[PDB]
Design a protein around this ligand. Structure first.
Ligand SMILES: Nc1nc2c(ncn2[C@@H]2O[C@H](COP(=O)(O)OP(=O)(O)OP(=O)(O)O)[C@@H](O)[C@H]2O)c(=O)[nH]1
Ligand SMILES: Nc1ncnc2c1ncn2[C@@H]1O[C@H](COP(=O)(O)OP(=O)(O)CP(=O)(O)O)[C@@H](O)[C@H]1O
Ligand SMILES: Nc1nc2c(ncn2[C@@H]2O[C@H](COP(=O)(O)OP(=O)(O)O)[C@@H](O)[C@H]2O)c(=O)[nH]1
Ligand SMILES: CC(=O)Nc1ccccc1O
Ligand SMILES: CC(=O)Nc1ccccc1O
Ligand SMILES: [Ca+2]
Ligand SMILES: [Ca+2]
Ligand SMILES: [Ca+2]
Ligand SMILES: [Mg+2]
Ligand SMILES: [Mg+2]
Ligand SMILES: [Mg+2]
Lengths: 347, 425, 438, 54
């Protein structure tokens, strides 16, 4: 009988995985403070990795990689890409970004203004976005907005030429769920989601952020055409792939998926030596939410990586069951056609 | 040289004590006359813990036999190993205690306790370094119960910093001599709460059920019951009587088994308990699952009704020490809802290579469980059923006791139950 | 030549000390009877090995060691063991009843009555030294004597030998090889009162030694003998610089100068490699790069933790056997480009390297295979704070219910010492977090 | 990758490699502790004996 503990009651994902584990009749849930467990569905923040792997006779497994925050932090990802030779500063799939500390607190204030002035002088599109959201084409507004705050921000180039879906003339992003097991195999969930903007993209007005921000919470709160083109401003791969064939005479795999799979491998292989639990006294796996942008040249850009992602309501069952198969049962077997795509690589 | 002084008082105490010395004398290779005839040096390694060495390479138990009537101790002297005991160590009267706690504790017993303490003092004076004392007795009678707890009280006064352990038989209506046993047991339990460091609670009802249902004994006798207690006493003292990485004296044992001074009442257990399919080799999984089974426990308490504060298992015989950890680590990590989570690593295991007589291997269980509250609950209920009508009290008031002392004994044990109840949540 | 006096306190210290001196004799060519044929100065000399061994007129090489235990069974093994002739009875001190795994009993009740005797015996060894450097104190955290008497002894040594260095080899408690439950209490009580008296402490987690003995030596259930034979190899690697001609870690003061910039943060992490089973048909001998790379694998650390998430304040590489500086630097470069070695900004990102050409000695009939080169890396990492966090958590679980406290109060300790000792450990954890995390 | 302080002897050698530059209680007080605990043990034992005399 396998035992597990739940230490994040707010996870819509692992609440299902926990719901499935008990459904097998071979997993027993313990109190959140019981140390004699096989599997910890741990808390997001300040997870005590130092207390794992010290219970005699117990093989212990946790659903977070200690150190993956370097990838899932706005500022961290920027520093990692610039300072990692595997990614270099000329990384062709990550928008030009700069880490900027508020003046009331290294920092890249002058480096940003150097590249900004260069663009202003060369008649080139010079619109940036600040987040940790304000979109503007003036460096004065972007920096003054960060000083009014008290945390670290990041200013990156705003994709002024996004790929717009028709009809609607609207922006969007792509969410990809990635699962990394204890052996550090990279599995890409075959089902993705496009979080589309239900408003027409407008380049002459960055004041109204409803057509520029494809967040599911901003569309369902500040957009007046929510749910018009697709249910809940969510288009799935089948429909999106069909649109690409009809409108662009190409495929989702060829035009975008190859770039997504490349970006996922590059980010995860880069930090493998720092977070791998191969020879560690405990084991780790984790589910990631990669957010991508697609420009009008069908080039894919990386927006950020989420370490504690949610799922699309229609895909919880399939993805959650898949987590139990490759991540949990692979280490704690029970008494297809995989839903994932294994991204082979050298360890 | 960490010597233990053994005291056995009353009928039950001396009959269980006799069988105990019979069992361990065999394990250490001591014949009925005190001469060693073993084949392994492990038998003599820790022999001086329970035995003195006299002239002629003779080994004499460090045992003091006490009773208020002669009968039982004449049977011991005529018993199998009767001649092995020091003649001076028989201390007995003629009046008897009449199953009366007040006679053992206040009248008859007081007349004899000083001569018993003279013998204890003598055995202690010849000890290189006394570990402590152990007393075998029943709580339902008069001598073991009333005089037993008087001896403990006076031993603690003279040896305040020595360990005092007891094997205490708890009365049961199913195996009862008189109706006043709940009175005698309630009065003794308070004495034990205050003046013992470890009390092994042996319930006569559990011993009976094991004989009838498990051992398939149609008509169990006191002898049959005492066969289970001998084996159990031999198991709980294995670590003291033989070498091994465990080491441990009485105090180090108490320090790790008793988290709170009043909650020092233990549930002992033994495996195997085979009926006569008796030659079948018992694997380590079977030993472990049986040892943790309630049917194998002698406190007549369901552990699944409470929580283990601390557990200690002792495995005897040549077996896989890796497989012992695997099965033990399996019973914990498969029933962790019955172990308190605020005493880390509260399940400990020890191995001894020498098995009991006629057994390839065995396992002895020592649990400090809050479920033991069910035993004191039963006693309290039987006490109250009679005390509410002052039934049978004249036997005690006739010995000078007041009703107030019964009310206090009642309030004390109900307190004890309440103390177990708060740590069970 | 400056002398080092070793002190062994409790069962663990005594049995570890016994294994070490057996190894020292094999390393220095000292027979069980104390004779040393290669020593051409009969009953005298100021050679490097003389830091640990005195010499009688008869040519016997006597360890500069004191064995202390409140019970005689463990030290009686020394008196009748193979090397019984090395020690004289004054060096072996035994009481009649131990501390029962009770810090308060070893520190207060029994300690008070034996401390002056132990000091007198140590004074006798000190009076034989022309220039004593300090003391090496071996003890367990969980034992009543190893925790309770050790701290008392350290307090008094700081009084009687103010200008002397004190190093520790401390056994960190591990449930897999312990029948006690109160060890977290004893561990925290002894660290609190010892912290300001120890200049450098090498913690060895029994959990780590146990798993190395199962994983590398294929011991299904390791015993204290298997554990101690391996532990004495690491100890020998750490003290070899004091016993052999050399220039790195030549005196106890250098251990603090090279490994402990901040005084309270004086617990270096030890990593050893290779550990090869002697029962093997025959192993391929590892290179400098391979064994130096192994020093950054969690599986061969004396304390299981993840240095990839701490910060380094210092780093010594102690090599024994066929090693030339050329290969060391080539292996270091190869590891910086592949490993996560983040030093603190107020410390140089460097490595002190020591090479002793004599390869590790192995006890005949032991579990360890003879290798041609081996290394022990001493690194002061904030990552070792994981060990304090684990230990302090177990302390908190029991102390919330005051479980077992009465045993300590019963011996004259005040309940406030628990909380006082606990708050010092919380401060110690905070120190590690200020140096390591951003 | 610099090597400083290279020392060589017949039994070995030592050196340093830099990869990157940077950026008590008195005897009396202990006696009081011991005697204070001793006194508390005596007080607790006296209360035990007083209990047993009652
Ligand atoms: N590595 C190793 N650990 C040991 C050894 N002996 C005991 N230990 C550990 O030490 C702890 C127990 O403390 P001990 O040293 O045995 O007790 P003590 O220091 O003699 O003090 P007392 O309580 O008076 O017996 C446990 O965690 C044991 O695992 C040993 O020989 N080697
Ligand atoms: N450089 C850029 N160019 C164009 N659009 C951008 C952009 N950076 C962010 N966006 C827009 O912002 C949205 C994502 O915002 P961001 O991910 O930075 O905030 P967030 O992390 O709180 C949302 P989540 O973590 O849930 O994906 C996307 O829909 C995208 O359209
Ligand atoms: N297990 C066991 N219990 C006994 C034995 N003899 C008596 N008892 C129990 O002990 C209680 C009576 O106490 P007893 O020892 O006879 O009184 P005493 O001689 O005055 O101490 C009753 O509960 C009996 O069931 C025995 O040999 N074995
Ligand atoms: C319990 C009790 O006292 N019983 C008894 C009965 C008759 C005579 C003497 C006795 O002691
Ligand atoms: C034998 C006994 O009573 N105590 C014991 C047994 C095994 C492990 C730890 C222990 O304290
Ligand atoms: Ca009379
Ligand atoms: Ca010489
Ligand atoms: Ca000092
Ligand atoms: Mg985010
Ligand atoms: Mg009777
Ligand atoms: Mg000891």
């Amino acid at each position: 009988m396998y035992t597990f503990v739940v230490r994040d009651e707010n996870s819509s994902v692992y609440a299902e995985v926990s719901r499935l584990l008990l459904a097998t009749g071979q997993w027993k849930r313990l109190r959140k403070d019981n140390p004699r467990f096989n599997l910890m569905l741990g808390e997001r923040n300040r997870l005590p990795f130092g207390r794992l792997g010290h219970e005699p006779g117990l093989v212990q497994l946790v659903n977070y990689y200690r150190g993956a925050d370097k990838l899932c932090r706005k500022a961290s990802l920027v520093k990692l890409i610039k300072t990692s030779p595997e990614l270099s500063e000329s990384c062709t799939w990550f928008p030009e970004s700069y880490v900027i500390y508020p003046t009331n607190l290294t920092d890249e204030r002058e480096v940003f203004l150097a590249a900004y002035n260069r663009r202003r002088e060369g008649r080139e599109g010079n619109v940036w976005i600040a987040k940790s959201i304000l979109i503007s084409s003036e460096a004065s507004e972007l920096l003054d907005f960060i000083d009014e705050q008290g945390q670290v921000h990041v200013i990156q180039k705003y994709l002024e030429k996004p790929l717009l879906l028709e009809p609607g003339h609207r922006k969007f992003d792509i969410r990809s769920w990635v699962l990394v097991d204890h052996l550090y195999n990279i599995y890409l969930y075959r089902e993705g989601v496009l979080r589309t903007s239900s408003e027409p993209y407008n380049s002459a007005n960055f004041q109204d952020k409803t057509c520029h921000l494809t967040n599911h919470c901003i569309q369902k709160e500040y957009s007046k055409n929510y749910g018009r083109y697709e249910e809940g401003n969510e288009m799935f791969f089948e429909e999106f792939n069909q649109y690409l064939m009809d409108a662009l005479n190409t495929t989702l795999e060829n035009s975008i998926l190859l770039q997504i799979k490349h970006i996922i491998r590059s980010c995860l292989m880069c930090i493998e030596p720092a977070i791998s639990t191969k020879h560690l006294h405990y084991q780790s796996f984790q589910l990631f939410g990669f957010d991508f942008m697609v420009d009008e040249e069908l080039k894919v850009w990386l927006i950020e990586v989420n370490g504690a992602p949610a799922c699309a309501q229609k895909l919880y069952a399939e993805l959650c069951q898949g987590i139990v198969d490759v991540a949990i049962s692979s280490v704690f077997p029970l008494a297809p056609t995989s839903i994932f795509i294994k991204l082979h690589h050298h360890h | 040289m960490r010597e233990i002084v053994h005291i056995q008082a009353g009928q039950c105490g001396n009959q269980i004590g006799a069988k105990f010395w019979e069992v361990i004398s065999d394990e250490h290779g001591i014949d009925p006359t005190g001469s060693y005839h073993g084949d392994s040096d492990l038998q003599l390694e820790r022999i001086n813990v329970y035995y003195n060495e006299a002239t002629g390479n003779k080994y004499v138990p460090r045992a003091i036999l006490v009773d208020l009537e002669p009968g039982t101790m004449d049977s011991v002297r005529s018993g199998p190993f009767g001649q092995i005991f020091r003649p001076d160590n028989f201390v007995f009267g003629q009046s008897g205690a009449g199953n009366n706690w007040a006679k053992g504790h206040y009248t008859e017993g007081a007349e004899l306790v000083d001569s018993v303490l003279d013998v204890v003092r003598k055995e202690s004076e010849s000890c290189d370094c006394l570990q402590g004392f152990q007393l075998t007795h029943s709580l339902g009678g008069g001598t073991g119960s009333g005089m037993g707890t008087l001896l403990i009280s006076k031993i603690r006064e003279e040896y305040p910093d020595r360990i005092m352990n007891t094997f205490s038989v708890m009365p049961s209506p199913k195996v009862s001599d008189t109706v006043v046993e709940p009175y005698n047991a309630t009065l003794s339990v308070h004495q034990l709460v205050e003046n013992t460091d470890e009390t092994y609670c042996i319930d006569n009802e559990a011993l009976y059920d094991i004989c009838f249902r498990t051992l398939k004994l149609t008509t169990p006798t006191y002898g049959d019951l005492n066969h289970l207690v001998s084996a159990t006493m031999s198991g709980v003292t294995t670590c003291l009587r033989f070498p091994g990485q465990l080491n441990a004296d009485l105090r180090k044992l108490a320090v790790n088994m008793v988290p709170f001074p009043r909650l020092h009442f233990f549930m002992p257990g033994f495996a195997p308990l085979t009926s006569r399919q008796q030659y079948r080799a018992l694997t380590v999984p079977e030993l472990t699952q049986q040892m943790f089974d309630s049917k194998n426990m002698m406190a007549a308490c369901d552990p699944r009704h409470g929580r283990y504060l601390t557990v200690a298992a002792i495995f005897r015989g040549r077996m896989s020490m890796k497989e012992v950890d695997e099965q033990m680590l399996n019973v914990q990590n498969k029933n962790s809802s019955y172990f308190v989570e605020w005493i880390p690593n509260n399940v400990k295991t020890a191995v001894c290579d020498i098995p009991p007589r006629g057994l390839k291997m065995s396992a002895t269980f020592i649990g400090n469980s809050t479920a033991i509250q069910e035993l004191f609950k039963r006693i309290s209920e039987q006490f109250t059923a009679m005390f509410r009508r002052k039934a049978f009290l004249h036997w005690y008031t006739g010995e000078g006791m007041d009703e107030m002392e019964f009310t206090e004994a009642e309030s004390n044990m109900n307190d004890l139950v309440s103390e177990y109840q708060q740590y069970q949540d | 030549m400056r002398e080092c006096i070793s002190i062994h306190v409790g069962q663990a210290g005594v049995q570890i000390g016994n294994a070490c001196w057996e190894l020292y004799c094999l390393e220095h060519g000292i027979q069980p009877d104390g004779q040393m044929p290669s020593d051409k100065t009969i009953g005298g000399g100021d050679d490097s090995f003389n830091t640990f061994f005195s010499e009688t007129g008869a040519g016997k090489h006597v360890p500069r060691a004191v064995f202390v235990d409140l019970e005689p069974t463990v030290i009686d093994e020394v008196r009748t063991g193979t090397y019984r002739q090395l020690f004289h009875p004054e060096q072996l001190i035994t009481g009649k009843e131990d501390a029962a795994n009770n810090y308060a009993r070893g520190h207060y009740t029994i300690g008070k009555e034996i401390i002056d005797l132990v000091l007198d015996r140590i004074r006798k060894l000190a009076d034989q030294c022309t220039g004593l450097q300090g003391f090496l104190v071996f003890h367990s955290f969980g034992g009543g004597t190893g925790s309770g008497f050790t701290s008392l002894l350290m307090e008094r040594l700081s009084v009687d030998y103010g200008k002397k260095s004190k190093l520790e080899f401390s056994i960190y408690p591990a449930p897999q090889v312990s029948t006690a439950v109160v060890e977290p209490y004893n561990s925290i009580l002894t660290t609190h009162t010892t912290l300001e008296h120890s200049d450098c402490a090498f913690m060895v987690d029994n959990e780590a030694i146990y798993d190395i003995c199962r994983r590398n030596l294929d011991i299904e259930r390791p015993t204290y003998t298997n554990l101690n034979r391996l532990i004495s190899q690491i100890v020998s690697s750490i003290t070899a610089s004091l016993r052999f001609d050399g220039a790195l870690n030549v005196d106890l003061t250098e251990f603090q100068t090279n490994l402990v910039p901040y005084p309270r943060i004086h617990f270096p992490l030890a990593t050893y490699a290779p550990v090869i089973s002697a029962e093997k048909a025959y192993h391929e001998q590892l290179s400098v790069a391979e064994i130096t790379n192994a020093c950054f694998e969690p599986a061969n650390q004396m304390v299981k933790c993840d240095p990839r998430h701490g910060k380094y304040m210092a780093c010594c590489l102690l090599y024994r056997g066929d090693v030339v500086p050329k290969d060391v630097n080539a292996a270091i470069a190869t590891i910086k480009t592949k490993r996560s070695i983040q030093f603190v900004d107020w410390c140089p990102t460097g490595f002190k390297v020591g090479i002793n050409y004599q390869p590790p000695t192995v006890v005949p009939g032991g579990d360890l295979a003879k290798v041609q080169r081996a290394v022990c890396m001493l690194s002061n990492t904030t990552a070792i704070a994981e060990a304090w966090a684990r230990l302090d958590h177990k302390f908190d679980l029991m102390y919330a219910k005051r479980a077992f406290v009465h045993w300590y109060v019963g011996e004259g300790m005040e309940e406030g010492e628990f909380s006082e000792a606990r708050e010092d450990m919380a401060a110690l954890e905070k120190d590690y977090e200020e140096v390591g995390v951003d | 990758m610099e090597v400083i302080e290279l020392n060589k002897c017949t039994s070995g050698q030592s050196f340093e490699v830099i990869l990157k530059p940077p950026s008590d209680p008195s005897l009396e007080e202990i006696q009081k502790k011991l005697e204070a605990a001793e006194e508390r043990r005596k007080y607790q034992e006296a209360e035990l004996l007083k209990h047993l005399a009652e």
